[PDB]
Amino acid sequence: MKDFTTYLSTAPVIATIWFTFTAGLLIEINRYFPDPLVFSF
Amino acid sequence: ATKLFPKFSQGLAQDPTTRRIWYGLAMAHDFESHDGMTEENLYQKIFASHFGQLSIIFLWTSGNLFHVAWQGN
Amino acid sequence: KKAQVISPVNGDPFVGMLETPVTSAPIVATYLSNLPAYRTGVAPVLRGVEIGLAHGFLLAGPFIKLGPLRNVPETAEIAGSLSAAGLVLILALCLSIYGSAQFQSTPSIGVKTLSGRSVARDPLFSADGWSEFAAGFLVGGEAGVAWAYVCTQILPYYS
């Protein structure tokens, strides 16, 4: 499955995975630390 | 064939299409692109056009004044 | 599966008009040939008079029945006839300046009649011919507008 993992390394798939990751990280940060208007913690 | 209106351009006067009219309307004050244009004649036509602009400005102000006086309160 | 109707123009498939019933039906060709526009031997002033009478008479109706004074009993017809007179005057002006603009180059190719015989150019398509045509159009159009008013006044069944 060298070719399949080459496909997963393509720009659109890697972009989808990375932005799902970034968006999920931000979403979980905003779930556990809701409404962060200022850096106070 | 050769027309008369774009006197400042023989290439536009020889244009058989409607593009001649438009481009002679829109190249009239590009004096530098005029056929047979000297720098001195350029500056002189600019001076005269400036006098004309001033006359138009003062006429427009005269009309504003006149209408405020005649029809205004 | 014979008898196709649509033909090339005068049998020339490269001139590009495609003779057709609406074009070359003998009733249509006859009617269009009998119109004063295509009476090339008749003086352009008289063809202009006929055309102008027709057009001045017809274009008064809209101004009469649909103009701004259409709902005033005796004023509707006067106002419409005068609007039509003005439009006829404007059209005569436009005809005159068209005759001034158009007829300067004197085309050199001759004309034929879709049969082979070369005819002379219509004197209408000259400076003098078009000037007299426009004079005739003005006279006939003002006359036809006046006659439109007269018909507003004298026709029994005019509403």
Binding site: - | S9, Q10, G11, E32, S33, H34, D35, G36, M37, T38, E39, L42 | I6, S7, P8, V9, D12, P13, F14, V15, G16, M17, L18, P107, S108, I109
Partner: protein, 143 residues
């Protein structure tokens, strides 16, 4: 090779007529005639829109634009491998041989055509427009 005179007794392809053909321009200023010799009766596309059958032997065609004639020329040369030549015809009756002006087609050389409009400098070696300013007519530095 010398300039061929246009034979007007040349037949025309079988065409049922269109509306993309000649206009008053042909009657007034100029139109164009293209001639070619076909080996067999073949259906080709008219640049005016439509399908025509070129006749076996010489074929004459009228057009109102040079681009139409050269479009048909490239079609006949690329799809049929023919050798057409076209003319410019005026309502005067004057015929001006145009396309293989030298006899050969311009993509090949004939050793005897003179070069025109050849600037012997680079395109980045043109002068600035401030040097050709007030040249009478409005000009480009390429002249």
């Amino acid at each position: 090779w010398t300039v061929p005179t246009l034979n007007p007794d040349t037949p025309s392809p079988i065409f049922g007529g269109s509306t993309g053909g000649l206009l008053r321009k042909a009657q007034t200023e100029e139109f164009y005639v293209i001639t070619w010799e076909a080996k067999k009766e073949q259906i080709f596309e008219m640049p005016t829109g439509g399908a025509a059958i070129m006749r076996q032997g010489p074929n004459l065609l009228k057009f109102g634009k040079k681009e139409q004639c050269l479009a048909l020329t490239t079609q006949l040369r690329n799809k049929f491998k023919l050798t057409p030549c076209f003319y410019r015809v005026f309502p005067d009756g004057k015929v001006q041989y145009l396309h293989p002006a030298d006899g050969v087609y311009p993509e090949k050389v004939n050793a005897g055509r003179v070069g025109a409009n050849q600037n012997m400098r680079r395109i980045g070696q043109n002068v600035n427009p401030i040097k050709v300013k007030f040249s009478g007519r409005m000009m480009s530095p390429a002249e």
